[PDB]
């Protein structure tokens, strides 16, 4: 037999919602991403301790196979994701335990009605600001979300559902 | 000063007229005397310090389990108080407080400063906790007039 | 035969001469692993394909670095005629679709908002004091404030400590009249010089300061005097009064003196009112 084969390219982006409440005593976790920040909104000022949500999609697949997860999710000060200070906020999906103000994992679909439920993976944290090392006083300089994400298809076998400590 | 009314912690005295509320930094509203917007210190005669303090001086509202004095005891800590204001009250001999003279006044000094915590990790350090600083004093005047009269006959 | 791996479709390109022998092939007897999509193509003699990554009976597999989808493109020829004869072999082509599936996707910028606070505030207060008669002990008031003439006339000043650092209190000014206007003559200023008590070295009388009962307590004793022509006895005495921490020395100012055969006052530190003698 012959065995043509060429590339694909696959598509993912992660975008930032709002926790906003159409109507007095609304689910925030269920309304944070009923809409999201256009290139416009930025830079979005955010106060300190506020919940932050994150949204990481695959995009222009219609295959239902494919659940993605996500490994190391970080912040910097720059754009370069291998600059410093940084600062952790997921390891192998499960969240950096050293935060009282821990991150958490959203993955609510049995009700978020979107087409393709598993292609995202949300999460949501509490908003900071990175701090000089040895003067203790905080800075303003601005902050940069980065993520790793993995295409984790249980037709391959593999249990990449965060098996965390909690 | 649009305090709302259910945490309106009052200053003076019922009977305290407006210009008098007025001139000890709280405001008035025809019929009462309540402290205004940001954070006030008074003194009294009987020698304690009066700390008001308003959850909105900082961003983000302080949880209010973080503050702490110059100096640290028992009566150093918070009394009475509510949802969005905190009130200290404790004697100026008390709580690390510092005196000092004056050719003509007594001055007696407290800082309060909140502990905003750092976080750390292996590769840098962040922090979610606005700083807080309030430095008062107290200022007491000696050089007071006194008079008295005596009736004086002879033998 | 060629093929696109488009994010949700597959595309592929079979051709008609599949064999490359000029030969009609594909009477409808071809599909693509289950489905037989084909675009009719009277020109380029490429029949077309589409079919849904997922479907058609696709294989998705994954490695360390790719996911794979895999087509199975068959070919069974139908015998044609009333005879079992197969002009053609059947024909299998296997189809991968290779993608990348670890991205590290970022955010843009998040600006951190907080407002720190820093002020100075402050208050001012009057300290209490009193000046007061008191009985011959002074312990106690004597509100009988009439006395005659050469009596002594039993005088406390003090100041109330509170909870303030311990106090010590001085007599800067007392001035005598017979009107509570200070500036009314007559006047006698009988303590001056930042606590001269000139009474004892003007009269030779016995008007003299008291050991402290207390740092924040003073004590003195004065001899009743009235003034020629005065027909009421009533004197108006208004005194300034001083107060500082006991921390604070006894100093040229802040003294309190009285002339008991020369200069010994304050309980002891004689030489603090030397410059009485002006
Ligand atoms: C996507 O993000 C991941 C983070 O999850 C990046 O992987 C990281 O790559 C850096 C090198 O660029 C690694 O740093 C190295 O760390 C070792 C000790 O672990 C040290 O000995 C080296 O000198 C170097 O500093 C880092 O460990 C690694 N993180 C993880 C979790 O593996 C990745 O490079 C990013 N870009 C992609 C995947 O294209
Ligand atoms: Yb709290
Ligand atoms: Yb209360
Ligand atoms: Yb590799
Ligand atoms: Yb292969």
Redesign the pocket.
């Known amino acids: 037999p012959l065995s043509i084969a060429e590339l694909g390219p696959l598509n993912v982006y992660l975008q930032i919602a709002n926790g906003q409440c159409q109507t007095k005593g609304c689910d925030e976790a269920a309304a944070a991403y009923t809409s999201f920040y256009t290139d416009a909104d930025y830079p979005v000022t955010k106060v300190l301790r506020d919940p932050v949500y994150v949204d990481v999609q695959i995009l222009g697949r219609t295959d239902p196979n494919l659940v993605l997860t996500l490994?190391?999710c970080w912040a910097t000060t720059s754009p370069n994701?291998?600059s410093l200070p940084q600062w952790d906020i997921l390891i192998d999906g499960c969240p950096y335990a050293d935060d009282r103000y821990l991150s958490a994992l959203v993955p609510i679909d049995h009700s978020s009605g979107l087409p393709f439920p598993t292609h995202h993976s949300r999460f949501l944290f509490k908003m900071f600001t990175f701090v000089d090392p040895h003067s203790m006083e905080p800075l303003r300089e601005k902050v940069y979300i980065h993520c790793?994400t993995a295409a984790c298809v249980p037709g391959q076998g593999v249990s990449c559902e965060p098996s965390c400590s909690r | 000063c649009e305090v709302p009314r259910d945490v309106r912690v009052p200053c003076g005295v019922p009977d305290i007229s407006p210009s008098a509320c007025d001139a000890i930094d709280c405001c008035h509203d025809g019929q009462s005397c309540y402290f205004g917007t940001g954070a006030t210190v008074q003194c009294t005669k009987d020698g304690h310090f009066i700390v008001v303090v308003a959850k909105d001086v900082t961003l983000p509202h302080i949880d209010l389990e973080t503050i702490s004095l110059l100096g640290q005891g028992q009566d150093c800590g918070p009394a009475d108080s509510n949802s969005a204001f905190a009130i200290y009250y404790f004697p100026v001999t008390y709580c690390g407080t510092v005196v000092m003279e004056e050719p003509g006044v007594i001055v007696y000094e407290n800082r309060m400063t909140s502990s905003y915590e750092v976080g750390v990790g292996p590769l840098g350090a962040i922090t979610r906790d606005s700083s807080f600083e309030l430095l008062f004093q107290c200022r007491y005047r000696a050089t007071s007039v006194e008079t008295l009269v005596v009736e004086v006959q002879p033998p | 035969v060629a093929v696109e791996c488009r994010e949700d479709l597959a595309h592929v390109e079979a051709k008609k001469d599949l064999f490359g022998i000029g030969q009609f092939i594909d009477p409808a007897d071809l599909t693509l692993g289950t489905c037989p999509p084909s675009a009719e193509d009277p020109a380029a003699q490429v029949l077309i394909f589409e079919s849904p990554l997922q479907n058609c009976g696709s294989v998705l597999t994954m490695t360390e670095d790719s996911l794979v989808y895999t087509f199975t493109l068959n070919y069974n020829p139908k015998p044609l005629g009333s005879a079992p004869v197969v002009r053609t072999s059947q024909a299998v082509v296997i189809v991968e679709c290779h993608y990348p599936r670890?991205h590290?996707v970022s955010s843009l910028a998040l600006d951190p908002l907080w407002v720190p606070f820093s002020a100075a505030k402050m208050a001012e207060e009057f300290l209490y004091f009193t000046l007061k008669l008191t009985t011959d002990d002074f312990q106690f008031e004597r509100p009988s404030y009439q006395y005659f003439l050469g009596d002594l006339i039993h005088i406390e000043a003090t100041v109330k400590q509170y909870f303030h650092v311990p106090l010590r209190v001085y007599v800067d000014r007392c001035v005598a009249t017979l009107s509570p206007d200070a500036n009314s003559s007559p006047s006698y200023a009988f303590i001056d010089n930042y606590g001269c008590l000139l009474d004892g070295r003007i009269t030779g009388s016995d008007s003299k300061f008291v050991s402290r009962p207390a740092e924040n307590k003073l004590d003195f004793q004065l001899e009743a005097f009235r003034f020629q022509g005065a027909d009421s006895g009533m004197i108006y005495i208004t005194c300034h009064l001083k107060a500082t921490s006991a921390a604070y020395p006894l100093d040229a100012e802040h003294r309190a003196c009285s002339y008991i055969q020369g200069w010994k006052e304050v309980s002891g530190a004689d030489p603090i009112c030397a410059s009485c003698e002006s």
Do not use: E
Request: hydrophobic share 30%.
């Open positions: 490994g190391r994701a291998f790793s | 670890k590290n």
